Amino acid sequence: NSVQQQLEALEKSSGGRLGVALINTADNSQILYRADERFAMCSTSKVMAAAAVLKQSESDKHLLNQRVEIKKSDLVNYNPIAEKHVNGTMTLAELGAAALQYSDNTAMNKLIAHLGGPDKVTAFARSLGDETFRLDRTAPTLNTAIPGDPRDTTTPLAMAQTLKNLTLGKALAETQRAQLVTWLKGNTTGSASIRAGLPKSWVVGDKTGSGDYGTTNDIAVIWPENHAPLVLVTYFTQPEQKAENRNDILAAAAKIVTH
Ligand SMILES: CC(=O)OCC1=C(C(=O)O)N2C(=O)[C@@H](NC(=O)Cc3cccs3)[C@H]2SC1
Ligand SMILES: *C(=O)[C@@H](NC(=O)Cc1cccs1)[C@@H]1N=C(C(=O)O)C(=C)CS1
Numbered sequence: 001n002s003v004q005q006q007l008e009a010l011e012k013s014s015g016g017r018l019g020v021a022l023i024n025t026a027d028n029s030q031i032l033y034r035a036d037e038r039f040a041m042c043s044t045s046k047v048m049a050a051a052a053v054l055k056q057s058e059s060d061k062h063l064l065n066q067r068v069e070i071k072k073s074d075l076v077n078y079n080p081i082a083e084k085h086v087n088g089t090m091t092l093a094e095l096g097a098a099a100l101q102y103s104d105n106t107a108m109n110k111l112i113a114h115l116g117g118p119d120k121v122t123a124f125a126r127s128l129g130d131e132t133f134r135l136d137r138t139a140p141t142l143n144t145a146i147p148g149d150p151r152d153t154t155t156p157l158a159m160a161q162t163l164k165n166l167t168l169g170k171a172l173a174e175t176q177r178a179q180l181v182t183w184l185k186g187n188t189t190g191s192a193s194i195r196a197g198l199p200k201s202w203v204v205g206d207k208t209g210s211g212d213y214g215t216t217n218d219i220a221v222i223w224p225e226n227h228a229p230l231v232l233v234t235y236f237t238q239p240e241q242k243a244e245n246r247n248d249i250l251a252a253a254a255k256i257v258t259h
């Protein structure tokens with residue numbers, strides 16, 4: 001059975017809608033599955049917000065060390081790092097790290113607020129040539145992931161192209177690119193997702209998302225030992241609002257497209 005047939009079968013048995021875009025940077029070849037369909041990004045959108053702040057830092061050498069005050073009233077539904085810092089400060093760099101490596105929603109909201117709102121994240125994506133990405137809401141509501149809702153969505157192909165540019169391409173100056181990569185490589189939330197479908201010793205940087213409608217996402221850059229990098233987006237969503245998340249489906253998709 002072909003890769004396409006395998007993805008079709010995985011999707012059908014899983015009881016959802018699967019979106020996959022793999023870019024092989026060895027030859028610029030692609031494996032696409034529903035790659036032009038919109039999906040709710042959920043917390044994968046934090047990559048774009050963190051990168052937007054990194055872009056700003058290219059013209060302000062003091063930005064990443066700027067103090068941000070964390071109040072009790074800033075806490076939302078999931079904030080394992082920010083809650084440790086209530087009544088204190090975190091730097092913008094520390095907020096980027098917390099957002100990316102722990103999926104701290106308070107940290108995401110501080111990045112968005114610093115930028116001037118969700119629309120500023122959209123404008124940053126557009127500045128990278130991504131005509132597809134849109135950020136409309138803050139956390140937690142950006143994770144509602146309602147079928148057919150365009151808010152806070154992108155397509156697998158658009159996100160793969162932009163993640164490639166961010167991490168391996170033209171988007172950021174070198175120090176900032178390297179910082180983004182360091183953050184992604186140190187993610188703690190992705191064990192059971194794309195990483196689980198790959199050789200254990202491959203280096204991976206990724207950002208997950210989990211939302212309503214059992215929406216389960218991961219976007220990754222993958223560094224094989226003897227090959228050029230791969231960029232992989234796996235998005236998955238289901239028909240029932242209260243559905244369980246399905247990290248294993250992302251692992252399976254990763255295994256299929258790297259087999
Ligand atoms: C850490 C995490 O939450 O993993 C997602 C998950 C997955 C997955 O795909 O990774 N799922 C499974 O493999 C499903 N588990 C079951 O269907 C087992 C059952 C439990 C209760 C009745 S059936 C769901 S249970 C939830
Ligand atoms: C990002 O996806 C974010 N998800 C949520 O806050 C969950 C919801 C909020 C409203 C409806 S559902 C955080 N990300 C992680 C992750 O990266 O997977 C989570 C596991 C949940 S918190």
Ligand SMILES: O=C(O)Cc1cccs1
Nearest residue numbers: 069070071086087088089
């Ligand atoms: O407590 C407040 O309302 C303001 C803050 C100062 C420092 C962290 S939060």
